[PDB]
Design a protein around this ligand. Structure first.
Ligand SMILES: C[C@@H]1O[C@H](OP(=O)(O)OP(=O)(O)OC[C@H]2O[C@@H](n3ccc(=O)[nH]c3=O)[C@H](O)[C@@H]2O)[C@H](O)[C@H](O)[C@H]1O
Length: 415
């Protein structure tokens, strides 16, 4: 027969990581693999959708209690509810899942041991140590692209990413969610300088099965019949900074001001904070919608009359926006956002920058016009992205770099 692997998938508890890592899980599942996903109890919900699409004989779940940590609020097991800077304790806590794992693996029949660990590069320090102790390959996953990795791995003071970055190099291979064509210069730069076994797979855009992680807040059918009933096929601008960002009130008043002034129709996705409003306008400006909480981002970005997306330029959002066929309006604020701006905005001329810093407040008047003119397909920033979508969308069709790379990956997992 054509032997397929048993993969022990270990995502990182955070939307940017968890969401594509399951998309990557479903992709290797489809190549006839067998997966065991390891999550803490509050994170078992994100596997439901994935479970309804595979046999209990091909898809397995290991659940371990979240190791408690003094700096993390009780009952929180996912970083998206926390300040991105809190990630430093999330690393610490999760690293104590090392011992429960070894007991599970040691008491597992010699047969059923996984062929490979497809874990988060953020957990690679201890996942590698577990991987070595059973002679299992530790392939690393990252939601960011080869460009960001090169800038980041090469830092002198890394700082607290050091151990995970250098442990990622000591891995078997690396899987990242972009494509070769997008950044060939850097895929090679990572493959030779920063991968001691010189194996990297580009498998993106990882687009989703069947929704995504996890449940929106205004019901998506109320959303979809807001869209079908707005007039022109490319004239709604969706505003959302993903899951990790929440903006200060001064900027909200400025961002809301541009929207009132811009005369364009829009959806705005505001989020929550945890540690343990604009003023009046929700019904002053129809249309129109203000989804608080968590929103149907991909249903919105692929809807017909959504032509512009104002974002932090997170990498998942870059790929969601690109697939969606929508102009990117970039406002970097932290994390890989600037490296994304250097590549997409500066280098490839595929997004218009509309904000500068984590602290910026924009000219209410300037932002309103960039917002009005942003949806029209003429702009050389939109078409350069519509070209890239052409390259991305066919790099994931059969014979594409990413279709092949996933094949070659599932295979090499068995060796
Ligand atoms: C580069 C990565 O950026 C990250 O932040 P974030 O979660 O925004 O990542 P995205 O790439 O935007 O993707 C996150 C995913 O949340 C989705 N979403 C969000 C809000 C909502 O209301 N509805 C949704 O569907 C969105 O569609 C996306 O799936 C992290 O700093 C990470 O460390 C970094 O490497």
């Amino acid at each position: 027969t054509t032997k397929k692997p048993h993969v022990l998938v270990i995502p990182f508890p955070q939307s940017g990581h968890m969401v594509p890592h399951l998309d990557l899980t479903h992709q290797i599942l489809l190549r006839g693999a067998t997966v065991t996903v390891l999550v803490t109890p509050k994170n078992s919900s994100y596997l439901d959708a994935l479970r309804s699409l595979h046999s209990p004989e091909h898809f397995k779940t290991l659940i371990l209690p979240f190791p408690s940590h003094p700096c993390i609020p009780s009952g929180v097991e996912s970083l998206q509810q926390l300040p991105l800077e809190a990630i430093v304790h999330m690393f610490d806590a999760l690293s104590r899942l090392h011992d429960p794992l070894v007991d599970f693996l040691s008491r597992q029949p010699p047969s059923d041991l996984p062929d490979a660990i497809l874990g988060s590069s953020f957990l690679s320090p201890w996942i590698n140590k577990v991987a070595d102790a059973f002679s299992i390959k530790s392939i690393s996953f990252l939601p960011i692209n080869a460009h960001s990795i090169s800038v980041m791995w090469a830092q002198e003071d890394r700082s607290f990413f050091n151990d995970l970055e250098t442990a990622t190099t000591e891995s078997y291979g690396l899987v990242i969610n972009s494509f070769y064509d997008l950044e060939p210069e850097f895929v090679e730069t990572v493959k030779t300088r920063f991968l001691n076994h010189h194996r990297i797979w580009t498998v993106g855009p990882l687009l989703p099965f069947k929704d995504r992680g996890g449940q929106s807040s205004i019901p998506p059918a109320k959303v979809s019949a807001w869209l079908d009933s707005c007039p022109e096929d490319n004239s709604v601008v969706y505003v959302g900074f993903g899951s990790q960002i929440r903006l200060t009130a001064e900027q909200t008043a400025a961002l809301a001001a541009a929207l009132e002034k811009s005369s364009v129709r829009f959806i705005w996705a505001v989020r929550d904070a945890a540690k343990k409003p604009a003023g009046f306008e929700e019904r002053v400006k129809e249309k129109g919608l203000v989804i608080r909480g968590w929103a149907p981002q991909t249903m919105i970005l692929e809807h017909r009359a959504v032509g512009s997306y104002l974002t932090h330029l997170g990498w998942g959002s870059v790929l969601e926006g690109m697939v969606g066929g929508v102009m990117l309006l970039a406002w970097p604020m932290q994390a890989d956002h600037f490296f994304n701006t250097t590549l997409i905005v500066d280098k490839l001329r595929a997004a218009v920058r509309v904000g500068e810093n984590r602290d910026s407040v924009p000219d209410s008047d300037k932002l309103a016009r960039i917002l009005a003119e942003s949806a029209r397909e003429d702009l050389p920033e939109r078409v350069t992205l519509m070209k890239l979508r052409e390259k991305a969308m066919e790099a994931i069709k059969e014979g594409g770099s990413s279709y092949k790379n996933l094949d070659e990956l599932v295979a090499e997992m068995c060796l």
